[PDB]
Amino acid sequence: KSFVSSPIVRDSTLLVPKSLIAKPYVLPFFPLYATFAQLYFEWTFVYLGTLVSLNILVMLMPAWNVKIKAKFNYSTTKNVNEATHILIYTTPNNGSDGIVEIQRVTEAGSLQTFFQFQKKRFLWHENEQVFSSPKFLVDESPKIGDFQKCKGHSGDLTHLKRLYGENSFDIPIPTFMELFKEHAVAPLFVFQVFCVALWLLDEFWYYSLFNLFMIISMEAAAVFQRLTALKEFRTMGIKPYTINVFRNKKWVALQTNELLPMDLVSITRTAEESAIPCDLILLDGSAIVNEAMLSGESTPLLKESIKLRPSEDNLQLDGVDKIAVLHGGTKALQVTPPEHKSDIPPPPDGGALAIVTKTGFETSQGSLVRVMIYSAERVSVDNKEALMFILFLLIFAVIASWYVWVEGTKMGRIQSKLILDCILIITSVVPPELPMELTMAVNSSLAALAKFYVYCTEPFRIPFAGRIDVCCFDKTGTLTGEDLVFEGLAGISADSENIRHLYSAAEAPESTILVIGAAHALVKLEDGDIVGDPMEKATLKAVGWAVERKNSNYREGTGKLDIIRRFQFSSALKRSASIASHNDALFAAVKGAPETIRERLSDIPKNYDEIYKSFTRSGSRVLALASKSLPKDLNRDDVESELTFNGFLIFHCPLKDDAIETIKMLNESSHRSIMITGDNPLTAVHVAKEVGIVFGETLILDRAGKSDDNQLLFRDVEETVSIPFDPSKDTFDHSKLFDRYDIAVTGYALNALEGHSQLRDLLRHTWVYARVSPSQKEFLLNTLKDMGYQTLMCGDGTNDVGALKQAHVGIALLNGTEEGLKKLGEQRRLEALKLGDASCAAPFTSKLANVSAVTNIIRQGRCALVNTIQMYKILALNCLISAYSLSIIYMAGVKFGDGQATVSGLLLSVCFLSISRGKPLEKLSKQRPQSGIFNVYIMGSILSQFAVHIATLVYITTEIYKLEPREPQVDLEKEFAPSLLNTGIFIIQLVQQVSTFAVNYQGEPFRENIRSNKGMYYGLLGVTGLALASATEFLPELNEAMKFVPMTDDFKIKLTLTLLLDFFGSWGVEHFFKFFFMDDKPSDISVQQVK
Ligand code: ALF
């Protein structure tokens, strides 16, 4: 039959529409209408009411669900030539199900049946008879022969236009009405308009009118808040610009929309506020890209061509062959034209030839944007907790409605008009805005965050950030600034009477300064700029070299130097070498970590082992410099064969100004903060000890000797204590090691301890991991998740992008300057800082440099959680109080007026306005809020406060019935007339709702006290003053204007004392339950102790 093969879909069945007669909501109902018309030709109007209600509900039901829609409207078919829709069942982790429309169109004499799901195309492959997404050639492993030989699209290419589609993000913003039409059918809005219809049937005109106005206003606000996000996602797509495209064996200038895979383009310097069109691959030339978006890093990489690789043999690896790929969405700082001639002519502009590989949403950035927009997960996915919470209130509602019905039957009330009061109560218990609470809280939190330049991409991670047990920090770029001072050269003294004897500058032998000048990766752009590693710039400026436009770097007052050919720098065998030439002869330079350089050169100074350990133990970060004279294009293992030492390079990387305070706050706020770095263990331990992650002594796990026999040693920064350990037999001693030393683990000892029984006993008591590879950070975060701890990681570069994506909440600190943002905002204003500039490296993205982003995110998540809790409690209590007051008043005849109900509504909306506003404390607290609706705190507090309120209500009702008696009459009508019961019940309801507002407000440990903020304090005092002036008859005209019967002087005392004691009882109960059951206990990892 018909299927769809794709990782998104799970199953699908074809559909075809049904005529209007056969639908379930037209034909089966005519017999019922006819039966009503026959039986009619009092008590029968309710029959017609419920009939029309069931009809409208069955008519609306297809819009709530999708399976119901496909079962009502469409009939499943198994012939692909007749269907006009298809129902797509999604996989459990990609978006939600949906119905999509099959389209047909003929091309070149053969029609092609297709549709489009989640902006991911499909087509109809006849020979397989299954809808299959387009598969690009670069996905499966190609031989680079066909990539080198490609010469652009020729002839008519409409089929490719249909298969791959245009190259542009397709994010449509719907008109306001076309979106309000989709919100007006949701179950919640339908229920609210149903309630308003009931209140109209009960002859409440002004009240229902005001309520309907409020409903419409809230829905329009929600639609605007939903449209602004779509308007924010659209800025990631660039604006099209013209690049020359090779088609039909000649250069014709096409725009960027009209690009297909395997199409030759010519890329140039990227324009302002633009990027690379699509995922290209260099075919000839050279470029220097700035992979800011995908990698969250600033240092410009250097991309190289593909022509040099052998054609028939090798395979396109995207491993070693990664210096040729150019992603989509990164800037290109400088591009150089091809050197030699080729079979194809040179482009007219100064650009380099490149081949397209992926277009549209299927590029690297495009796939992430699609998953971000369409297949995103909403907050509070379960929703069963909220539904059960609403059902509990409805149980209470039925418990009250039964008594209302029994007493209404007793007092001779008309049943036909009593069923409506039962329905009013049962529908008044239900609060409509309950499930959409966390979403509004999260939106407010996101705005308050974006005020700090901390832009977020996936917003369902905010409730995760409240209760965090472990925080992981990368060292270089996160806890340590980029700017680094230069202390001086060391170890050049051949005599070396002193170990810590440094040579500053202008005193080293000329060989050393030549080596420090020749071996660098800087380049001077044509316009005039220096782009490269900031460390090399600092070193090269401090020594006194200067880089020129051509590769020569000279004018240092000591000669002229030019760089002939250089070698790249790789993490494996980390070192960099380059070949240079001076006026006299030719030599070579090399600069890498001192360990690897040691095993390279022949002449080994007697104290080489001691010097770099003496300089690395205390803060500094050393590198080695070695050279060799070379007499007059060859391999790398020859230039690095034998070398001669020339000194060290000793840098002091200082901490960020905001690191110590952030780590101190996180340590005091019941969080455990650990370090995961890539530097050698001694520097990691020193920085961790200076910041405040380790306190006491520290032990290190490393290899014992040069033998790789997998035997570790517990060593110390000073070699005083050395405890041997063996992974095969020995097991960690708890009180001998972990209770004294706060140990730190290396990447090698972590790799050798795999499979141990005590790996998960060691991963609790260590706080510093050093020399870990980019793949082991993923393993560490996966294990810290598996143990049951929620995690956080904040890292800058590409060493830790996998870790950032694995952690529960990930932050990427994009190092920037405040004055740079000021200049950018000023230029934008003359022409805020939209999300478009933020990267796609992690969920969150701090646009500034300082580390306070972690604290800020934690604070906002915590406040969102606690605000949700208080809103749950307040809504439930107000609803229950209102329902039981309505029941007490409806048992007898009397009912509220119109103005009384409207005034109550306005006086409570006054408090609803203020209560949302709150300010968080600057310091975090040890008490973290727990997640969930069902727990002892919420249910206990709600139930007990409600017990107090019902006690008060029963007491005053007994008193009122004692003062004036009501007798059961025949054929009553619930009419409004000023009496004592109406007054008593109205004042009590209005006072007790305000009392719950004032009692269930969240206090000091999480936010600012109620007394502090005035917009709520003064509102509550105003409403209390009005209610108490009403209850005490301070103004007779005020009571007369609202039709309040004069109360006997003895009754005022009971009423006022009753309310004033109700408030105190409620306050005491809630304070008790809060002080006992509020905050959950922190984990077994975030405790502070050492002997
Ligand atoms: F210096 Al790193 F991960 F950025 F070890």
Ligand SMILES: [Mg+2]
């Ligand atoms: Mg880093």
